[model samples]
Target chain A: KKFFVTNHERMPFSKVKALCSELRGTVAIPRNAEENKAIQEVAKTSAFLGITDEVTEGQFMYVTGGRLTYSNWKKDEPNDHGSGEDCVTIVDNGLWNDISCQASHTAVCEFPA
Target chain B: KFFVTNHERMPFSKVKALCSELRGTVAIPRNAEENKAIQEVAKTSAFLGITDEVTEGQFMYVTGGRLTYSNWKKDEPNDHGSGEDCVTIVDNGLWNDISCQASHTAVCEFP
Candidate 1:
């Protein structure tokens, strides 16, 4: 499976999910640095992946509804605190951070070819 | 108790501005507990505002506190490359010399 990166500005997290769904796949589930950079390189701002813990705060799962065994966080963040926040995004420097899902962000869809 | 805090990633100059806005100076942990507390908040190596630009190895705190307590990892604060006069505290709390222009999380101090 390869990845397709979108511009820095795209639809909402859910909207991106739907777009990926229509494209016969899901939003990118960055399993490692290579995939992470593939998306990060194209984004001018933070970009969204298909990971979220909204199902249960702090219980991050992939769009496929699967828990992640490997995780990366930017420094002390993911602070993993508060409500109104439960989505993941790849930050500007190609690191991982949890941002609120509603805010608009770009997306990187996983394309299994 | 002095309250410590952070701001978005920025250079030492911006970090200075944020601390002053809060009526605090960039901190130099005074004791072991202070070190641990700041380290707890700073997961990555953070800008500490300590500098030796005045005189090599004569690092001084911005608040004028004595450099009584510190951990300089071997080969650290080496000022090895140009602009490596600023100090940062790593996750393990060891000090390293970094560029004043580089952007990183700054842990500021306020009482």
Candidate 2:
């Protein structure tokens, strides 16, 4: 079992990267619906998940490593909206969307239970 | 618009009075945005304006409202062996319920 937590602190995806490291945790990542719900519960508001396509467009990978084996991108989303959306955010409904890494959102970290 | 701390370590009760004396309230974060703001100003763990003193498990804000947001650590608010009712935000921004009489840093929020 894994538990997710947030300081309830929002920051750019970059800052979250360091904060999670400092906490000795990793930015929250969900591999399935159950895990997604757990993360959603911790982040009451839309928050940056550990998934991103910053390395290669249209190919989202978890910050921990590798390509996504399970995904929940919202309909008509991951379109790389606006200039360029490299990061991913899990919204209220547990759906994912590609967004700018620079945009601030809640930082949720995952830890072993 | 900001959170500030004097890095003063004191009991929760004294922290409350200190914030009040400074014309602000004990630091309370309404959202992740402000939560980050609060974390930055507090270099170390600090008491937040939240407690479950009135009702053992129901944390209430100093502003007389129920908690609209929370960031409890894993298995926290457990009330522990000594009955911890006060809350503290550690350096990493995670929250823990601790004894009110125990000393922690004091932080205040300004409009």
Candidate 3:
């Protein structure tokens, strides 16, 4: 099973990834609704997820390096607003949005055992 | 993803082994909600999937890593008798360290 946890610290996408790495885990990635809810259980706020389109525009991939198989985007999102949005965040309502990586948000990590 | 039990009391070692046979692990609660859920599923005291056997005083979950949430009873887990390394949750959802050889309810968690 995959369990999500957080220190409740808000940081940019880069820092969020590093923080989870320091904890010997990875930034939380929800493969389905149950996993997403598990993340919500701990996040309790908007937080950066491990998915990004940084590598190639219009093609989001997991930070661990793979095509994203599941998503929960709000209607008409991933617009890559201002061409500055490459990172993804799972908001309070559990819907996801692509945003600027420079924007700071909460940090949540996942441990798969 | 959920906890279950046979309502059978056994030593921690036996509990761990039993869970494996069922393709699960000893139940582990990661947060208060889960602890409560596990508590509800377990009407009585039961062993949790956590212990400090590897390094005294630093309790770790059987799956891995340091415990992020705990509900230890006040002034408890004293490791009384210097032989208490395994952990158990009582009917009140509070935790206590006890001897692994001591009999307690066996609960398993499955993904």
Candidate 4:
């Protein structure tokens, strides 16, 4: 099955659509400066309810099956809690912060096949 | 401060904007018929990436602070689970279903 991961805590379908519309490429970001530039542009134009920040390390990554493989987690960070906090949250520098799964935080959800 | 209530669980600002664009009136439903009609139109035209359903009884309401007073909850329903399940969820006939506060379900958050 295909899984989509995001930096947000939950992946609501509506937020995903708006984010996709604001972004030029696939919801997935490409590994290149050009792709980063595109993401920045989308972030600027995006009128989603949440606040926008310049591209950060954790914000860049792909989500799969309610989980994500982020490129921006701090070194040795993402403690992942003992039980495993698979949910993703965006933190400073866009770095990913893996917190408790039951933590109450804003997030984006994805639809997987 | 004024509060807005809705049948949806959470009301995100982004979704509210899209819903407002699709609707002809204010984010808040105005009256009985016009408000309902406008909401239906929004539900149909909204392309925020979710399915649309015909207007129902509970679907008509405003959101205020994180609580709502839906017009479509079943009689004596919404048991509130002791303390309270203030979150809103849309159920059959657009009726509101009050569940546990920590319940995980699809919801819309307002700004």
Candidate 5:
């Protein structure tokens, strides 16, 4: 069983890179047309595996790192990360943000089974 | 992609029979020494699938039916169904009960 973890928020590329290094999982950030297609494949598989929408409820965001070490949520932001916002951002725990999915950010991936 | 549904409660055997008729899935219930071993296998697999602890919280209980049509929770039972208590039951949306996992009940089996 291949477990794919996702971070559906806008994050710094540096943080995203760090997460990727920690979990050693697959990063599904689509840079171009071809990459977008591959990301779609990851999304479909995650859905089939019964991941909660909280993890895969966006279009462009993908799994890029392991357990989040930071949060970029703006003041009074991410109030709806679970309700329906579908995007997430983490920076130093208190600075998490929830922007549009299309916004570019760092992401982490994990392969824990 | 075999989906196994369970009714972790005591229900009328007839109701269990009906649910089995509906979902077209597997119904697991221990009857004897042989059946208990089979149930264990199912439980292990369900755990691997990452089903919430609420669904697989108890011992001895296994998947038996589909979407519950009846809840056997007693007056104040199930308030902690998601918190800690691992067993569940249904009976017409009322007259439900929450006993230990070892307690036997009518479980409906479905897809």
Candidate 6:
């Protein structure tokens, strides 16, 4: 499999999502531990993941197509930090966090092996 | 609970020494999930316990263990240049071959 984490020219989640689609890939979806670790290793900065809950505040789901069976939220995270913190990211030691969707951060891309 | 230092960034030798003092060793990514968690917390490049000191391309861990698993980046571990016996884990979760003297944050695991 292949994954990309480009923090040099960060982009918002929506843009990153579209860009990955343009590139024949998608923002990374860490469905398992290995996939999770792969994206985390290259995210020079807190980057966007294919995971999000844009549909609802607490109903987080992966846009790549599946329910989030495993989670790595940081302490008190996905609390929707603010009213609209709807995007997910790698924040700390493999922990996930819900943050502002428009915030510019790195993009994590993934393609089949 | 896991304990990661803020940023004691040091050479591999120095960092491993400190971990030994704490009864730990430079963190090793035994599995992809654990590896992903490790870098997410690190937030920067880190020195992993993998090395090819014994024989080139024959990486071993600080615990004297074999590679539990690995997720190498494309065209990496080139052993870059004359000799890069050590390994560093980038945030992207791929392992890179580097010099043993390069300074980077250390991740430790304890009993």
lDDT of 4 by residue, B1-96 (tens): 011112232323344443343231123322344334333423322111121122222232333231142334455334344532222323222333
Cα distance off (Å), candidate 4, residue B98: 37
Per-prediction TM-score, chain A only? 0.86, 0.96, 0.96, 0.36, 0.30, 0.88
What DockQ do the predictions score, one after another? 0.01, 0.05, 0.06, 0.02, 0.01, 0.03
At residue B74, what lDDT does model 6 achieve?
89
Q: After superposition, how far is residue B55 of candidate 3 from its true place, in Å?
A: 17
Model 2, position A49: C-alpha lDDT score: 91
Considering just the first chain, candidate 1 attains a TM-score of 0.86
Q: What tens-digit string does per-residue lDDT give for candidate 2 at A4-108?
A: 656567899999888777656688899789999888876778999999998889998899999989988899988998899999999969898889999999887
lDDT of 4 at A74: 48
Q: Which parts of model 6 have CA positions greater than 4 angstroms off?
A: A5-7, B1-111
| TM-score of candidate 2 chain A against the true chain A | 0.96
Model 1 over residues B21-102: C-alpha lDDT tens digits?
5445776777778777777665667788688777777888876644778878897767776658788888897778888788
Positional deviation of residue B1's Cα in model 6 after best superposition, in angstroms:
44
lDDT of 4: 0.32
Better of 2 and 6 by lDDT: 2
Candidate 4: give the TM-score of chain A.
0.36
- Residue A27 of candidate 4: its Cα lDDT? 42
lDDT: worst 10-residue window of model 4 chain A:
A45-54
Question: Could you tell me every candidate's TM-score relative to the true structure?
Answer: 0.48, 0.54, 0.54, 0.27, 0.23, 0.49
Model 4 lDDT tens row, A11-108: 43345445534421124332343433333332322111121111333342243222233244446765656765544444444444555434544322
**CA lDDT of B18 in candidate 6?**
65
What level of docking quality does candidate 2 show? incorrect
Error of 6 at A63 (Å): 0.9
CAPRI class of candidate 1: incorrect
Q: Which model, 1 or 6, shows the larger DockQ?
A: 6
Residue lDDT tens for model 3, B20-46:
765679999999998988887676788
RMSD of each: 15.0, 13.4, 10.2, 15.8, 16.7, 13.9
DockQ of 2: 0.05
Ranking, lDDT, top scorer first: 3, 2, 6, 1, 5, 4
Comparing 4 and 6 on TM-score, the stronger one? 6
